[PDB]
């Protein structure tokens with residue numbers, strides 16, 4: 855049986871997927887940020903295919919290459935918006951589009967996007983406690 859797992863999502867240079875400012879409002883974007891204990895870097899990978907933080911779901915704002923990612927209300931989002939799959943090698947795919955979560959820098963406020971998979975170092979996401 856698949857069980858939920860809470861984890862940090864660790865990307866390029868060991869920075870963590872982070873909701874900017876720690877706010878849990880709908881449509882707040884995600885970025886990379888130095889890893890810390892804050893709740894906005896704690897993600898739960900669920901069996902249902904959602905990835906959640908602070909009670910909200912990671913979603914792209916659109917389904918095209920270059921769409922930025924954000925959090926939004928889960929129950930309201932359609933499966934296409936909210937379903938992801940994390941592969942063992944680190945690819946984090948947006949299931950409906952086949953695009954993958956991609957970082958856009960390690961400096962502040964570098965908003966993550968979904969892009970065509972190029973097996974770039976910006977497209978590998980590790981789990982950590």
Ligand SMILES: *O[C](*)[C@]1(*)[C@](*)(O*)[C@](*)(O*)[C]([N][C@](*)([C])=O*)C(*)(*)(O*)[O@@]1(*)*
Nearest residue numbers: 872873874875876877887892894
């Ligand atoms: O600026 C940016 C930043 C990030 O987002 C982090 O994570 C946070 N923290 C908490 C605690 O939330 C801040 O605020 O912001």
